[PDB]
Amino acid sequence: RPTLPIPDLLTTDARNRIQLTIGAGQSTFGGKTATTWGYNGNLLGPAVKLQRGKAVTVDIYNQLTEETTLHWHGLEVPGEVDGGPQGIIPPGGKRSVTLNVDQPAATCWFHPHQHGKTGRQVAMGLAGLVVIEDDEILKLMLPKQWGIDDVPVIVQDKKFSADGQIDYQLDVMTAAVGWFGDTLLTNGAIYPQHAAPRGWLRLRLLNGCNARSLNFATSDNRPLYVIASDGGLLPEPVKVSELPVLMGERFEVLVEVNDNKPFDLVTLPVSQMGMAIAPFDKPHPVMRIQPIAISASGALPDTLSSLPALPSLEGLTVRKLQLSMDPMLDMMGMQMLMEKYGDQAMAGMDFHHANKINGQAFDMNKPMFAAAKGQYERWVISGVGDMLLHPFHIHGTQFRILSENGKPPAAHRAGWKDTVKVEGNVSEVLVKFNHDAPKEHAYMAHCHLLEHEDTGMMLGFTV
Ligand SMILES: [Cu+2]
Numbered sequence: 001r002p003t004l005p006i007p008d009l010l011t012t013d014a015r016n017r018i019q020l021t022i023g024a025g026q027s028t029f030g031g032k033t034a035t036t037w038g039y040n041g042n043l044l045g046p047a048v049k050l051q052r053g054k055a056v057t058v059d060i061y062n063q064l065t066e067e068t069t070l071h072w073h074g075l076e077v078p079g080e081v082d083g084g085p086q087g088i089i090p091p092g093g094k095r096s097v098t099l100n101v102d103q104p105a106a107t108c109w110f111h112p113h114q115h116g117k118t119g120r121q122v123a124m125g126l127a128g129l130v131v132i133e134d135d136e137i138l139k140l141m142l143p144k145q146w147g148i149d150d151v152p153v154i155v156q157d158k159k160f161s162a163d164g165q166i167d168y169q170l171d172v173m174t175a176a177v178g179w180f181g182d183t184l185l186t187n188g189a190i191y192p193q194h195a196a197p198r199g200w201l202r203l204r205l206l207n208g209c210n211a212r213s214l215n216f217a218t219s220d221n222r223p224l225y226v227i228a229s230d231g232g233l234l235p236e237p238v239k240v241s242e243l244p245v246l247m248g249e250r251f252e253v254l255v256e257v258n259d260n261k262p263f264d265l266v267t268l269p270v271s272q273m274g275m276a277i278a279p280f281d282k283p284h285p286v287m288r289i290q291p292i293a294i295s296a297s298g299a300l301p302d303t304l305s306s307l308p309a310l311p312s313l314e315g316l317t318v319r320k321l322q323l324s325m326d327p328m329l330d331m332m333g334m335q336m337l338m339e340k341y342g343d344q345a346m347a348g349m350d351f352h353h354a355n356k357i358n359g360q361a362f363d364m365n366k367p368m369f370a371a372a373k374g375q376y377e378r379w380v381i382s383g384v385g386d387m388l389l390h391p392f393h394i395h396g397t398q399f400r401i402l403s404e405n406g407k408p409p410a411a412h413r414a415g416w417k418d419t420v421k422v423e424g425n426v427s428e429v430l431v432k433f434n435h436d437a438p439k440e441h442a443y444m445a446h447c448h449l450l451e452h453e454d455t456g457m458m459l460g461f462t463v
């Protein structure tokens, strides 16, 4: 097996600048070349290291022949640097942003947000990581040797045509059920191995799929200890036997490594339409962990952080967001899925503006509302009316889940989140925006099933 590719950990230079070049190159999958896009390389991207309380300037050079944007998913930053669809970077041009980092330690990520094309641009290879550090986390003495006992694990599916190229289409079927493939990548490699020292191994897990939900576990059923969600540390570790991860979500887990006992990180079949077709009808390996007989220094502390109680809900502004899909698109798309793949597409379970929030397909010129700055609001997001999965993401914040799809959140999901599950039911989140966003650079709120976002399931809002 190939070794797990380890993204470079990138910090500022003497001018306080980080350079990111967006460009086309080539990658090899199963022996066959494909055109791919990457940040500072051919595919995927570096891990940008940020420090709470410090500002960094990022110089972003678009060397593609089409327009793109660069969005920092999970970062609490003003709209002007948020890199939503209004944050255009012309082909052959450059945009610079200054990020004033003001949130706790977390694994965030970055990716394109081009209007109507975010799914294609992510599918072509663009994604990178953000590692935010703070003073609190350093004192815990977690595993922290990058590429050794602290590793990022970006998991993505793709499908390829016979000629070896990535086979991306936004069409009636994918607008309805999402773009998904038959090949699983881990930091861009197929089923890599990672050598790890005896003791604790920290995995920063990102579901970077367009549409496919994941469910992590180990091949020999050793537990995962969840220590962090999208927005940072949980108050205490939470032991789990499996870990569902929606599109765009991150979790950090610790797992024990013992001499002479290799095991695989795997993903278990999910109950999502289209996602349990071979090879994903069965547990699917993500990466092999190969124990090395050298002692690892990291700890799993009993206490990680302090999590504040939920405040009172009385008096808070309520904003209701009703997700919907044109009945026609939903029917046509699902029929096409069933015709192609049959019953296995439900195992365990104009289209360009067909998906909507509050009856409206995304209008970039018309933010739907102006949210308060520095005030808690309660946002109620409903998927009642269809049975599709909508991981709902809100820019400019780390929120607390009050109810996830009609039930209180599980413990590992009760901390700081930027995504909430919505699937045929109603979710409620407690959100606060610390930064402004004007109409010309609005925050987005949308489904992170990228084909739904690109066909209208997104709104802009100001702060
Ligand atoms: Cu985001």
Ligand SMILES: [Cu+2]
Pocket: 388, 389, 390, 391, 447, 448, 449, 452, 453, 457
């Ligand atoms: Cu959706």
